[PDB]
Design a protein around this ligand. Structure first.
Ligand SMILES: Nc1nc2c(ncn2[C@@H]2O[C@H](COP(=O)(O)OP(=O)(O)OP(=O)(O)O)[C@@H](O)[C@H]2O)c(=O)[nH]1
Ligand SMILES: Nc1ncnc2c1ncn2[C@@H]1O[C@H](COP(=O)(O)OP(=O)(O)CP(=O)(O)O)[C@@H](O)[C@H]1O
Ligand SMILES: COc1cc2c(c(OC)c1OC)-c1ccc(OC)c(=O)cc1[C@@H](NC(C)=O)CC2
Ligand SMILES: Nc1nc2c(ncn2[C@@H]2O[C@H](COP(=O)(O)OP(=O)(O)O)[C@@H](O)[C@H]2O)c(=O)[nH]1
Ligand SMILES: [Ca+2]
Ligand SMILES: [Ca+2]
Ligand SMILES: [Mg+2]
Ligand SMILES: [Mg+2]
Ligand SMILES: [Mg+2]
Lengths: 422, 319, 54, 439
């Protein structure tokens, strides 16, 4: 029955994961106590994808909360929808990871990883037919980055034929916590290239710019950034959660979006970012606009390999089809000509909360190489002088492992440029 | 913003057409293998008509009629005229022709052979010399209209545009490709009026510039020398022949109810005898134009053949 | 134009009109194909599990 | 009486199968519960409709059909639908997870694990047959199941039922109607493997049906229900001769005999007329001449192509309703002097005509208006090769970069099969050219 097991790891992963569950619970009419109080059976038709059904017809998120310190998960448990989560699905340590990939991946994380897999195993057993896994985390910290990728590796070992999907938050100096973020991100990307089928690249620089320049927020907070991510995650998973014309799961998505195994890093987008309803041409225009992208990459600096678009709300399906075809026909140079009809659109009649209609963008563009280039430069700037390396070598790592991760990411960049000139 | 592709770099006519499209700011040229186009300036050979009109949200137009090769090939034209009831063997404006393979009309040609001068193509009074050379064998017009002074031969080229609605437009400006050498009914330079031949084997450009006489001069000549006009003595027959050929093949090539649309520029070649009778020589599917007529004609193509389908933000005679 | 083979019944009729005269792999082989692909999947997975073991 | 077993594979096959059997029941006067008041011979008989329907002691008329899909959601709508009582539970076979638009996954990975179950359930129906003719296989080209599992099924059917004819109803992929980017791959892969196992295949281009529904039915965005009910009419017209009294195409063998001179070139072009909107209050009934002339209009074809620039090998006219042979001949004689109908020199320039007096049945509340006469033309034209060329070109574009190939290789398929399948299609295009084109 296409069940998905959700995992959220670290501070960022849990804070965005919590918001995601708050949003879709509302869309499915699930109250903070886990009771259904909706008005449409369309909300319950595919509820099993993300929710287990309890004893007294209560719905419990198939979610596992992981962290190396109890702080954020104490906040989640005390949050608005904090009581909806299964108490046994809270797996945490006390040491923390100190924004250190090595601690998350090799030392502190290794002590906790088996306990997480136990809960993962238990959730998978309650699935009629496990579709795949979904992970929310950041790449700049220690737990989400280090332990998160360790989890992914452990999961692939036990479930080699299941789809692995991540929403990965990319660090940036503009919204930074520590200077070692490029180290942690580069080490993680190496893991993601090999062990994920689909990765949504969420750039904190893009999230900030959207809040500052577009939403007119002079002082954006993580909460403001997470609002955008929460909305994007809802739209991305729309065809998973709601009945519609589209009969497809995560594997069908991966098959059609990923022409080459390593190139599975997507640029998410959302529109609108007010009481004035948007016309279909406006939704389509904004959706393809760089300012609505969340990877901080200019799509005009590359070419689209594949594009997926999801429109939500009651609108003319003809007008949607016309506008989508319009964009392709007006900008044919930004789409690869060696993949016929590489832009697909799906429509869901059910709009999200607060909007009469909206559009979600999922692009596999070669322009994403700008994100990895940026990280690679910040990495190299420090690594050439071996700056801050002692935090990692003190945890048993050697310089060779950094060189390899750096090499693999630069290879990833070159492979994107290779198909940009095809 | 309309989009188009170019798949024939050797096209003189459509190199100017694409230039004009870009000079409107409403047309954009795409890569040759880009399927997301509105207009296609296709290749002369093996044009993939089968891939046209299958792209969603795109009205597609092509500068060639599929099946028009039946009219624009030597042997196909002869076969078409004979086997079509609307043309028949009693065509009257097309010289007696026979298709000969090196079907076929070999015995029938000899039966008519027995002025007995013919010409083979794909000039001799002996049938034995013709066959041993070999294609189509056509009766050579031994009595052509000769321009004076010079006592010289000529042919008439007419440009015809047929749009997507199958309207037949005749360009006002035709051209006479004349011979610069005096005619001799007893050396095939004064017998062949091709521009490439006259610019080589010939006294070239003695009478007119580049052996090209245009309609206004030729009309004035007819009035002075024969007391008649170009319209009456010649153009009436030309317009008739053009209309006969294009209407005959219409139901076979019309894109009226097709998933894609077609238009095409044609080059009709005529011969005029001393009785002021017009004979059709052949039809060109990919013709070139006169140098001084490129500007006007190509703009005419954009106006009635292209913009009629894709409107932006007469030099033709409708037949 | 000739009409031939005219057959009639309560439900309808049929005929032919002429206008112009004219001028496998065995079960075993399939099993091998399926098993060969299965073994190629097994090898690729074993390589993955080996790579993860390293 | 000789029986025919229908097999529906994947979402497209199943949903189209639903539309067909719905129509079949309406045409034969069979109620959704299986009861048929017209049938006086209770619990048995060898009537023409018994070719598609078996009978139980309770008087229920059960379709000789099998529904197979690698995921349960589509077939589940049959199990709980209007015709839930019509089918035996055994006939409705479902798997756990689908082929994910991957030919290799449907053919090799999942197919291996479920093929024996399917054949066994088919064997059940075969044992009820006194003289099984063969099979009718409905599927899409683009689906992982429709392409992958079908080709495997066709191979095994040739083994277990060697003397039996197999006919195909295939859905050709169109970007206007929900395609995946990898569907050109699946199309070529399945056509290559199924080619030697199919005696006659009817291709239906989703683009054509989509445009017919927009143009003739005034539906801006046709749903699958709109498309399938139109498809079911064409399918009904083709199989009417098997289900009713007649003398043309009475067995599956006749389809090959009358339409397929060369085994590989077994893809007849279908053309249907008229398609009239039910919302259209005032409409003039078309004559025999008018609906016959409409058979030579590209806009009414199941596959968009130009028969004017191809050659005919065979032509069959299937009329339903108020039609007499006199009007047919008067129409044909007229059409020949207006249309460009070129037959190959080694074939008789002629038409095999079949007429069923009962006018086309339409689903109550449907989009199709009731007409007094309609015709389906089945003609084997080399012009249908345009569809192969379009499809092969899209294959070439992606395969030149080896795009998406890793998904197929990851399922145990070898990369060589891609080239092997493409070379077979290249040969197929060449066959059409040798037969249809002059130098
Ligand atoms: N005409 C018509 N076409 C359909 C229908 N359903 C799917 N298709 C077409 O089939 C193609 C996709 O294949 P499907 O049949 O949906 O997939 P499948 O056979 O179930 O195989 P899976 O990938 O395992 O799901 C698309 O090109 C659709 O246009 C239908 O009900 N009617
Ligand atoms: N039956 C005939 N009688 C007299 N002159 C003839 C003739 N047939 C051809 N010609 C002469 O033939 C010359 C034209 O060439 P023709 O039309 O035969 O083919 P071509 O070699 O020009 C191919 P294209 O027109 O595509 O360039 C003219 O100069 C004309 O004088
Ligand atoms: C589970 O949800 C989705 C699943 C899929 C697709 C998709 O994007 C529209 C989804 O929504 C996010 C999808 C994507 C892209 C394609 O080409 C780029 C394609 O061929 C095809 C598709 C989907 N198929 C169709 C016909 O849209 C199947 C896989
Ligand atoms: N968008 C977003 N980014 C965050 C959030 N919290 C932390 N980050 C980013 O994640 C990185 C820090 O990693 P973090 O998750 O806090 O450490 P961890 O607990 O070890 O996984 C930095 O680049 C932060 O910018 C959040 O709530 N939202
Ligand atoms: Ca410890
Ligand atoms: Ca009975
Ligand atoms: Mg932190
Ligand atoms: Mg010439
Ligand atoms: Mg399916």
């Amino acid at each position: 029955m296409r069940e998905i097991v959700h995992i959220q790891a670290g501070q960022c992963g849990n804070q965005i994961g919590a918001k995601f569950w708050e949003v879709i619970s509302d869309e499915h009419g699930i109250d903070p106590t886990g009771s259904y109080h909706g008005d449409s059976d369309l909300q319950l038709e595919r509820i099993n994808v993300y929710y287990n059904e309890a004893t007294g017809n209560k719905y419990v998120p198939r979610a596992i909360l992981v962290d190396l310190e109890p702080g954020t998960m104490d906040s989640v448990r005390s949050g608005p929808f904090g009581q909806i989560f299964r108490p046994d699905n809270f797996v945490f340590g006390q040491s923390g990871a100190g924004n250190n990939w090595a601690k998350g991946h090799y030392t502190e994380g290794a002590e906790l990883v088996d306990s997480v897999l136990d809960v993962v195993r238990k959730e998978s057993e309650s699935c009629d037919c496990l579709q795949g896994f979904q992970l929310t985390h950041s790449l700049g910290g220690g737990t989400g980055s280090g332990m998160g990728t360790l989890l992914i590796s452990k999961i692939r070992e036990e479930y080699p034929d299941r789809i692995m999907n991540t929403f990965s938050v990319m660090p940036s100096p503009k919204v930074s916590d520590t200077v070692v973020e490029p180290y942690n991100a580069t080490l993680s990307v190496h893991q993601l290239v090999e062990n994920t089928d689909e990765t949504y690249c969420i750039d904190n620089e893009a999230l900030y710019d959207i809040c500052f320049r577009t939403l007119k927020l002079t002082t954006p907070t993580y909460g403001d950034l997470n609002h955008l991510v929460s909305a994007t995650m809802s739209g991305v998973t729309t065809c998973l959660r709601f009945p519609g014309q589209l009969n497809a799961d995560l594997r069908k998505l991966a098959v059609n979006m990923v022409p080459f195994p390593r190139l599975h890093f997507f640029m998410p987008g959302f529109a609108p970012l007010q009481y004035r309803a948007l016309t279909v041409p406006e939704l389509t225009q904004q959706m393809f606009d760089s300012k609505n992208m969340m990877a901080a990459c200019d799509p005009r600096h590359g070419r689209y390999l594949t594009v997926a678009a999801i429109f939500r709300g009651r609108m003319s399906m003809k007008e949607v089809d016309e506008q989508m075809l319009n964009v392709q026909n007006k900008n044919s140079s930004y789409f690869v000509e060696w993949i016929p009809n590489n832009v697909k659109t799906a429509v869901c009649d059910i709009p999200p909360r607060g909007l009469k209609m909206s559009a979600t963008f999922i692009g596999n563009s070669t322009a994403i190489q700008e994100l990895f280039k940026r990280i690679s430069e910040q990495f190299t700037a420090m690594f050439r002088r071996k700056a801050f390396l002692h935090w990692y070598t003190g945890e048993g790592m050697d310089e060779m492992e950094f060189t390899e991760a750096e090499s693999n990411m630069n290879d990833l960049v070159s492979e994107y440029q290779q198909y940009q000139d095809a | 913003m309309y989009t188009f592709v170019v798949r024939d770099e050797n096209s003189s006519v459509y190199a100017e057409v694409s230039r004009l499209l870009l000079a409107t700011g409403q047309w954009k040229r795409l890569r040759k293998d880009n399927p997301r186009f509105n207009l296609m300036l296709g290749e002369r050979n093996r044009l993939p008509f089968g891939r046209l009109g299958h792209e969603p949200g795109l009205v597609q137009l092509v500068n060639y009629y599929r099946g028009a090769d039946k009219l624009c090939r030597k042997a196909s034209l002869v076969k078409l005229i004979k086997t079509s009831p609307e043309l028949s063997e009693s065509c009257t404006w097309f010289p007696e022709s026979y298709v000969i393979y090196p079907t076929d009309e070999r015995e029938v040609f000899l039966a008519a052979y027995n002025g007995n001068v013919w010409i083979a193509k794909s000039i001799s009074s002996e049938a034995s010399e013709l066959l041993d050379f070999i294609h189509v064998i056509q009766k050579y017009l031994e009595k052509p209209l000769l321009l004076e002074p010079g006592h010289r031969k000529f042919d008439i080229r007419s440009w015809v545009l047929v749009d997507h609605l199958y309207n037949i437009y005749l360009y006002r400006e035709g051209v006479l490709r004349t011979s610069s050498e005096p005619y001799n009914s007893a050396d095939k330079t004064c017998h062949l009026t091709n521009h490439c031949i006259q610019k080589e084997y010939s006294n070239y450009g003695r009478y007119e510039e580049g052996n090209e006489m245009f309609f206004e001069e030729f009309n004035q000549y007819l009035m002075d020398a024969l007391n008649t006009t170009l319209e009456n003595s010649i153009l009436l027959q030309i317009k008739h022949i053009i209309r006969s050929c294009l209407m005959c093949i219409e139901p076979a090539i019309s894109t009226k109810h097709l998933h894609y649309q077609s238009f095409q520029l044609f080059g009709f070649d005529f011969m005029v005898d001393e009785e002021l009778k017009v004979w059709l020589i052949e039809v060109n599917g990919a013709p070139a134009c006169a140098q001084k007529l490129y500007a006007e004609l190509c703009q005419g193509i954009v106006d009635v053949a292209i913009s009629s389908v894709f409107p932006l933000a007469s030099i033709f005679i409708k037949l | 134009m000739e009409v031939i083979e005219l057959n009639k019944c309560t439900s309808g009729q049929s005929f032919e009109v002429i206008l112009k005269p004219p001028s496998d792999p065995s079960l075993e082989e399939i099993q091998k194909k399926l098993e060969a692909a299965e073994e190629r999947r097994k090898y690729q997975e074993a390589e993955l599990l080996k790579h993860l073991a390293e | 009486m000789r029986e025919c077993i229908s097999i529906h594979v994947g979402q497209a096959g199943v949903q189209i199968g639903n539309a067909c059997w719905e129509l079949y029941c309406l045409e034969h006067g069979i109620q959704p519960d299986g009861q048929m008041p017209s049938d006086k011979t209770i619990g048995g008989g060898d009537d023409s409709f018994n070719t598609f329907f078996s009978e139980t002691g309770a008087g229920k008329h059960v379709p000789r059909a099998v529904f197979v899909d690698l995921e349960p959601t589509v077939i589940d709508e049959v199990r709980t639908g209007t015709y839930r009582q019509l089918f035996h539970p055994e006939q409705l076979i479902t798997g756990k997870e689908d082929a994910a638009n991957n030919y290799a996954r449907g053919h090799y990975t999942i197919g291996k694990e479920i093929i024996d179950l399917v054949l066994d359930r088919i064997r059940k129906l075969a044992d009820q047959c006194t003289g099984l003719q063969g099979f009718l296989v409905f599927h899409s080209f683009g689906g992982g199941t429709g392409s992958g599992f079908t080709s495997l099924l066709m191979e095994r059917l040739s083994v277990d039922y060697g003397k039996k004819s197999k006919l195909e109803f295939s859905i050709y992929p169109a970007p206007q109607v929900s395609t995946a980017v990898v569907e050109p791959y699946n199309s070529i892969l399945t056509t290559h493997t199924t080619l030697e196992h199919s005696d006659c295949a009817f291709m239906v281009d989703n683009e054509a049906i989509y445009d017919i529904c927009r143009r003739n039915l005034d539906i801006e965005r046709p749903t699958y229900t709109n498309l399938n009910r139109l498809i079911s009419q064409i399918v009904s017209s083709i199989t009417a001769s098997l289900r009713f009294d007649g003398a043309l195409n009475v067995d599956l063998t006749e389809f090959q005999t009358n339409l397929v001179p060369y085994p590989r070139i077994h893809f007849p072009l279908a053309t249907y007329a008229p398609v009239i909107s039910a919302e259209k209050a005032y409409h003039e009934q078309l004559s025999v001449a008018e609906i016959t002339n409409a058979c030579f209009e590209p806009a009414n074809q199941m596959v968009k192509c130009d028969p004017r620039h191809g050659k005919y090998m065979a032509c069959c006219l299937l009329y339903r309703g108020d039609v007499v042979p006199k009007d047919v001949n008067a129409a044909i004689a007229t059409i020949k002097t207006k249309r460009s109908i070129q037959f190959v020199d080694w074939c008789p320039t002629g038409f095999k005509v079949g007429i069923n007096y009962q006018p086309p049945t339409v689903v109550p509340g449907g989009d199709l208006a009731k007409v007094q006469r309609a015709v389906c033309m089945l003609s084997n034209t080399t012009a249908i090769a345009e569809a192969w060329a379009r499809l092969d070109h899209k294959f070439d574009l992606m395969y030149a970069k080896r795009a998406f190939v890793h998904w197929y290789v990851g399922e145990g398929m070898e990369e060589g099969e891609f080239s092997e399948a493409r070379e077979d299609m290249a040969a197929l295009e060449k066959d059409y050219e040798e037969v249809g084109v002059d130098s």
